């Protein structure tokens, strides 16, 4: 039993809710919140820009030190950093950004990072400003993640389409 509330159960381990991941994180304080990161951990917009703003830019400061030490992530890769005031940990995961021409096949690799964590609050990878089809992202999520994932979908119209089209 965990403290996530109001989610529709898609599968044994995947749950979905129309919610602002920032507000969800501030309520639940999950062990792990997933960020829709880019390889540079430049949290300018989308989910990343919103999560960073909620940390008063502390996420960006920590991220810049991480990059200065380790260099960029790989597309499909991840790193674990602090969750600041939002969660214990933030798993920064880089899905392919279609608006950059990155291979959508890397989306499965991106979701595989979730399997290293028993429970996660997460957005759909590569959705929104990363330019992938969110229906496809949900399908890859369900077919790849085996741990318990609670998906927050900000757009209510998108949330309804994801549920009504789910196979």
Indicate the residue whose CB is closest to ligand A1BBK. 128
**Smaller CB distance to ligand A1BBK: residue 73 or 127?**
127
Segment interacting with ligand A1BBK, rule: CB under 6 A, options 61-69, 86-94, 123-131, 142-150? 123-131
Neighbour count for residue 71 (Cβ, 10 Å): 9
* Residue 140 touching ligand A1BBK (CB under 6 A): no
Q: Which residue is nearest to Cl ion (CB)?
A: 128
Per CB under 5 A, does 98 bind Cl ion?
Answer: no
**CA-to-CA distance for 63 and 91, rounded, in angstroms?**
12
Do 85 and 65 meet the contact criterion of CB atoms below 8 Å apart? no
Range in contact with ligand A1BBK (rule: CB under 6 A) among 4-12, 15-23, 54-62, 76-84: 15-23
> Interior CA angle at 64 toward 62 and 65, to 5°?
65
Shortest Å distance, C-beta 69 to ligand A1BBK: 28
Q: How many residues bind Cl ion (CB under 5 A)?
A: 3
**Of the candidates 5, 4, 9, 6, the residue with the CA atom closest to the CA atom of residue 166:** 9
Contact 107, 137 (CB under 8 A): yes
Cβ at position 52, least distance to ligand A1BBK in Å: 11
Q: Give the integer Cα–Cα distance in Å for 43 and 165.
A: 31
Contact positions vs ligand A1BBK (CB under 6 A): 20-22, 46-47, 50, 123-124, 127-128, 134, 152-155, 158
């Amino acid at each position: 039993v965990n403290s996530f509330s109001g989610y529709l159960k898609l599968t044994d381990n995947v749950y979905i809710k129309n919610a602002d991941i920032v507000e969800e994180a501030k309520k639940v304080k999950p062990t792990v919140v997933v960020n829709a990161a880019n390889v540079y951990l430049k949290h300018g917009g989308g989910v990343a820009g919103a999560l960073n703003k909620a940390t008063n830019n502390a996420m960006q400061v920590e991220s810049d030190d991480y990059i200065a030490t380790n260099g960029p992530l790989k597309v499909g890769g991840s790193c674990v950093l602090s969750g600041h005031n939002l969660a214990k940990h933030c798993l920064h995961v880089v899905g392919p950004n279609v608006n950059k021409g990155e291979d959508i096949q890397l989306l499965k690799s991106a979701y595989e990072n979730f399997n290293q964590h028993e429970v996660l609050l997460a957005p759909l990878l590569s959705a929104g400003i990363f330019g992938a089809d969110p229906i496809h992202s949900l399908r890859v999520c369900v077919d790849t993640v085996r741990t318990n994932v609670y998906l927050a979908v900000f757009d209510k119209n998108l949330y309804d389409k994801l549920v009504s089209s789910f196979l």
